[PDB]
């Protein structure tokens, strides 16, 4: 396809032109759209699964991840936007977004396509889901239109992102802010805290251990809870120990770990601590992770614990009990749609070594960057008297209008050229 | 002037009294217009910066700062309301607010006074100018009417405050808290913490410092960068340090300096920080930074480090890696009037003995503190159908009907004359 | 008009520019045609420079495996221009590339290739990847997203700019010489660039003595060159230890990463305390040295101490600016516009088939001159009028840079 | 007035000429290249000294950001400098290439300080086709026998009603030039730029500075400090110099040292660069001094007008008569980059006011008209597209300015026949 307006015709056909939201935010924007082209390489089983975002507020729009030959995943790429908007504009709200997948062209020297495709979207987030099977996506809603099962690859889907909540604000992105440092390899930004997500923690409840000593020490995991993130995010809380046994030290480190199983992050918070015997010694968590260490998304955070003693002389025992709370702080992401509105596609017995195309647009009311609004004019969004009331009108009716999320490309087809 | 209702009669001309918007927030409230009227003091040069803040929420209007003779700008005063807000109610927020800067000196002659005026409102923030000299002003922003420039200071300016959203809650104000303590200079009190801003910065990413010993130390800074508060704020994470040699203490201070170049806040976050070689060695940034400790708005903040070493009289070596990151959030930053929009009311060459003036008018939105709630009934807005509609139509039609956010006074008494 | 039907559809012919530039010259015309395989990844980039004023065409990279590129061949045109000519100019170019393998069935093959114009260098460009492309131009007529590989692009070469002189290509002078690989020419230089780079204002250094020294990279910055350079300027040193020698080398680096040219500059430099002193830069690159498309130059210095001991602390501190000359290369067309055509995965085994033809204005040598009569242009008035209101309305008329293969035939068929 | 942007609205090519705060417009000639319009402005207060009178230097072809300097006239016949006078706009900032279109710029005082109850004052002004250190004398009275035009003169003034400076052209199809734009570039120090400057025209000066000169003196403690030359070059970007002198002797135990400055228009030094420091040279045998130099934009404030070499000469040991003598040859070079581009340094009109009472402003306000092609950035948020079609505009302009003393068309206007030029034109 050879890429190169009301709300209403925006909203349901996107590939348009964008528009501008009728609520009652009003603040000098401009309008700005966009697509997003891939050829997505498949794997030796031939499966795979694709992770969209629906109404994420700007540039990162899912992932893609492979199947492999032993039921593990693997991260293939964070498939994003075409430009950087973070590099040219400080603020950003999402008007509207289709995305299309399809696998119509065959490898070299065959006869038979050989695939089919499962879509679903749900409420929740990406690591709430039970399961991820291609027999199981179809059981995560009861809606009756928010699934379709084994579209011909021939054919595919299109995902329309339909709107969450109207009266949003406008967030930041994590854009780079003028700052001098010693470091060539030095990040300054201001990034998107708006409707912070909360995760308290508590991990010891007076919990008690014990083992014997082992030259090097021995390992435990506290916890492994399970969290969801896509940007920056900060770690607050303290755990105490109260001992008796003379000389033993500790350490600790924390894991974040992404949807494939893999650690992508670690950090020491602890190295070489001695415990004192008769009153509390504190470790505190205060630690940040930026956005730019995070190359995948975030499924679960791990606390491991080593116990070494200095002077060991093995056949005894060690003894520590512990208490404390934590608070991960996933920093915007309780805003509506940063993480809330995740679709999955799920493909099957594609041939090896083909490809599986997607295609985008994606309709913003961006703010301009401090030297673009030197450059590029900013005004208020135009003027309808009965939109809002109709797209109500729209959705409320939206089993007998028929208007879904997923489907086949050759009914949204007709449906688009119904309409149009 | 002589200082001393529908929502669009108290929009475009906020002298004329108070209203309630006709957003669907719909609280118990009591309305309120006061005033702010000032004589300021032209220095040697002649040449100033008023910074106003229209959209702010409540009791703050503007900053005055003179230019010395040298190029640097001097920090005058704070301009604020007449009553102060947080002493007596509880939440705000804003409706419409006026701003008039002239000259009242008058001549009896046939030639005026020297004297001139820019002014420039523009999306960013105070912290995010490429210059702030009175010729660079009008580089600021890119739509015609939003800017003016060489109007004479017999003339004048008004600063018009047209929004930035609707359907947004109440900011509490920095109201005193009952407490009792021990030292008399403490204070207790609530802070606005509605939509906060975050700005992570990665200080080093395993920098590697080497340098001789001397007497005191060696003093360097690590990085310098932009941020932006008026209000109170609360610095968090850790930043850890690896060597080979083992004698190093190192302390370390916080700078947050405002916009005329001196430090407003110095804080050291260590202070005789013994390390061991070999090992990790953490250094914690737990920090909170009050209302009532930041006395002008603050526009940057920087790292020291001062690396000495303990019983190294002779000219030998020390040494260190560093990486860490940091959590600058403040509190309420995001909220739309709190710091984005900003208005820059600039003079040059004042004739000497010549005074500027300030006149304005404030509307405001207010919930009392528990003390006067005892004795003024509050009630819901009383509502128009259409008022809100209308409010859409007119800032769709903006730029044929010509209504700016800067004007000369002349222009905008015509315009008064002509809209009633 | 026989310019405007040349210069809409350049396989036609060659045709005089009617700008006032009253040169004696004679019109040529030639082909450059190429069969490229492709890769395990299937996947690449090929950068074309469509206003150059002669003799080289472009250049193909292959994507690997991970995120980076290599370098395959640098495209050219069938004969070579400098072995017979002095001077020459550009009057308009096409280039066609899709893929010579067809389907036998129904469904095609796997494949699909972007193509975007850009306003600027090779260097000054965000991102070089297959999504990215279609980001770096607001134009509308300027770029298109997912055309097939078994249709493929077709890349007009619109103006720059008329009323341009002619530039010296890359011919040689006779030279008698004691080595064989010893090359003299006469290079282009005519509007040259200019990049001046501070690298350091009283930047101080401090290491421990190591055995082999300490290596720093001192700056890294993009200048973008085809053809012959210079590097100039000058940095000054100033210590107080006794006994540290510096070395020094530049590197020049190509689009994918490799060093293509590395100059030494300092070799047993010994500092000395209480003075001022310092190191020059004197380097000239040739045009045959340069093997692919230049994007980076850095310069890196070793400190090493004469009799080193365990410690002993080398410091010294340096400033003084650097300036690198590009000899021709601020010459409209020479760099200033590119055209970048990205395939992403096709299948394997396919052949990527390039063909076009660009046409010249070039001034013979001095024994193809013996053998060949030159002439003024070809008066036709109402050419340039008309060749601006062409190019005025542009939008209206739908004249693309980078067309679609059969909206091209369309186009052409209906302009006939 | 109230100076209002512009930008919203295009104009014909004359129109934007002869009246540019009308509007920007496109430059019909040959030059067919995708851009975009842009019109900035530039608005000061000068304040006048305490003698009462100063001298302002426009450029009215210069291709990007810097309209001028002004300098103030001293008690002992000396200049000062103020401030140079820049468009508000930094062009570099989001831009790369540029082509002047128009300007006009008005240069008034009709206000009076606190306390006096007078005017008092008046304004001659002049252009001139040479450059700044090419004048012969630039007081008040010398200004006005600068040049034979009576179409570039005007004489006594009064400063309230002021003048107005236009430019008209010097060359046209012009090219691009390159503005000093920051290129992309990491490296260890945080005072690190790396730009890309403007060289379409050189400007090549070269100085023979030595000849087999001699040089005698006694030994005196310090060292002998001698200027070899001084010469006018008029840089008012970067620039570089490059050559070599060469030194020869037969007395032993000699050193020396070399440092070159880069005089203002007022006298002062702007550049220091020390070239050779404790340079110890052998007998006989030629001894090297090459000069390997290179200047950027950033170190340079004010408008370069001389250049000075100058040698400090020094014996190791001493007394009283040991008979220093050394003797040099060689030739330099001194280029300057984008300097014979027609507006970036040869026209340039002068403005210089007398007793206008002390501390008062002098305003200056103006607007400019550009053609520019984007930056990495802003190209791609942002629309570029040729230039409209006009047949015979071309053709009009050159009939115009070829008829201009008839008409009476001249660069500087006293602001009222400007006024009423501009009605009769409406």
Avoid at 85 to 90: C, I, M, R, T, V
Avoid at 298 to 325: F, H, N, P, R, Y
Wanted: proline share 5%; aromatic share 8%; net charge negative.
């Amino acid at each position: 396809t050879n890429l190169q307006v009301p709300f209403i015709r925006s909203l349901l056909m996107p590939t348009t032109g964008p528009a501008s939201i009728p609520d009652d935010t009003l603040e000098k924007h401009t309008l700005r759209s966009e697509t997003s082209t891939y050829n997505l390489t498949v794997g030796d089983t031939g499966s795979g699964l694709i992770v969209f975002f629906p109404g994420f507020p700007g540039s990162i729009v899912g992932a893609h991840y492979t199947l492999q030959s032993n039921g593990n995943y693997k991260f293939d790429q964070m498939l994003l936007t075409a430009q950087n908007l973070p590099a040219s504009y400080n603020y950003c709200r999402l008007v509207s977004r289709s995305l299309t997948v399809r696998s119509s062209t065959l490898p070299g020297g065959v006869y038979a396509l050989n695939g089919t495709i499962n879509a679903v979207t749900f409420q929740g987030s990406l690591s709430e889901l039970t399961d991820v099977s291609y027999n199981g996506l179809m059981s995560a809603t009861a809606n009756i239109n928010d699934k379709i099962g084994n579209v011909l690859v021939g054919e595919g889907v299109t995902v329309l992102s339909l709107p969450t909540s109207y009266d949003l604000g406008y967030v930041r992105l994590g854009d780079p802010i003028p700052a001098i440092g010693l470091d060539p390899k030095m990040v300054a930004t201001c990034d998107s805290s708006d409707r912070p997500r909360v995760y308290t923690i508590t991990a010891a409840d007076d919990y008690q251990f014990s083992s014997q000593y082992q030259a090097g020490g021995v390992t435990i995991t506290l916890f492994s809870a399970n969290i969801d993130a896509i940007t920056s995010l900060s770690i607050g809380g303290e755990l105490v120990f109260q001992t008796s046994v003379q000389g033993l030290i500790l350490g600790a480190t924390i894991y974040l770990i992404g949807f494939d199983g893999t650690a992508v992050i670690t950090r020491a918070v602890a190295a070489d601590n001695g415990l004192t015997a008769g009153t509390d010694n504190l470790m505190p968590f205060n630690i940040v992770i930026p956005t730019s260490e995070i190359t995948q998304p975030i499924t679960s955070i791990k606390l491991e614990i080593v116990t070494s003693k200095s002077g060991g002389q093995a056949g005894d025992q060690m003894s520590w009990s512990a208490s404390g709370s934590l608070a991960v702080t996933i920093h915007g992401g309780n805003y509506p749609g940063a993480l809330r509105p995740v679709t999955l596609v799920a493909y099957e017995r594609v041939a090896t070594g083909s490809v599986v195309t997607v295609a985008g647009v994606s309709n913003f009311e961006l703010i301009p960057n401090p030297e673009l609004a030197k450059n590029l004019v900013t005004e208020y969004g135009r003027f309808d008297p009965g939109a809002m009331n109709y797209t109500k009108l729209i959705l409320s009716e939206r089993d007998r209008l028929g208007i879904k999320t997923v489907w086949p490309t050759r009914e949204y087809t007709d449906f688009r050229e119904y309409f149009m």
